[PDB]
């Protein structure tokens, strides 16, 4: 069902894994739970057309209360992209680089 309208917060710096997949821990600051977490990679912050691919299968925030946790993993493209969590003006982004 519906996406998460509130703001996220990285609770730890994203980290590269096995062959270049990045994992992300966030904390959600909204009371519209339950809701699907807006997670994706992107290269154009205007279009937010998904680059890469979200590896986490259907990430939904569980609780209906403020401050819940969540862990996501994505498959970023080669070179430079942006991790993009949340929607709107409260979007959070972190630059990513993947070599080979």
Partner 1 sequence: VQLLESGGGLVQPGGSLRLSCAASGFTFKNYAMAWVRQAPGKGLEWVSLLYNSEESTYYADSVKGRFTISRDNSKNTLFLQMNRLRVEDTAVYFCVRDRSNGWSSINLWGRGTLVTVSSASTKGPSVFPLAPSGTAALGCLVKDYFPEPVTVSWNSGALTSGVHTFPAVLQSSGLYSLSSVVTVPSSSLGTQTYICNVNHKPSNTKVDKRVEP
Partner 2 sequence: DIQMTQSPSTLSASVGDRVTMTCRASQTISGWLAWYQQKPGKAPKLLIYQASRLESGIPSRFSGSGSGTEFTLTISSLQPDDVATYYCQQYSTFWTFGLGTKVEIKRTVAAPSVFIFPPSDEQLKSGTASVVCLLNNFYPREAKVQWKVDNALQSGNSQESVTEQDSKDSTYSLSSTLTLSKADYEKHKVYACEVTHQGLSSPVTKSFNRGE
Q: Identify whether the C-beta of residue 84 lies closer than 8 Å to the C-beta of residue 42.
A: yes
Q: Identify whether the C-beta of residue 22 lies closer than 8 Å to the C-beta of residue 95.
A: no
- Which one, 55 or 87, has the nearer CB to partner 2? 87
Q: Which range binds partner 2 by CB under 8 A, 30-38, 43-51, 69-77, 91-99?
A: 30-38
Does 36 interact with partner 1 (rule: CB under 8 A)?
yes
- Which one, 66 or 80, has the nearer CB to partner 2? 66
Helix (H) or strand (E) holding 42: strand 39-42
Structure tokens at 87: 């929607």
Minimum separation from the CB atom of position 82 to partner 2 (A): 21
């Amino acid at each position: 069902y519906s996406l998460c309208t509130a703001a996220f917060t990285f609770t730890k710096i994203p980290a590269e894994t096995l062959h270049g997949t990045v994992t992300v821990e966030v904390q959600y600051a909204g009371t519209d739970g339950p809701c699907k977490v807006p997670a994706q990679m992107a290269v154009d912050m205007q279009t937010l057309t998904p680059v890469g691919r979200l590896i986490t299968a259907n990430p939904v925030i569980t609780e209906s209360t403020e401050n819940s946790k969540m862990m996501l993993e994505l498959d970023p493209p080669f070179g430079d992209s942006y991790i993009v969590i949340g929607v709107g003006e409260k979007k959070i982004t972190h630059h990513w680089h993947r070599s080979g």
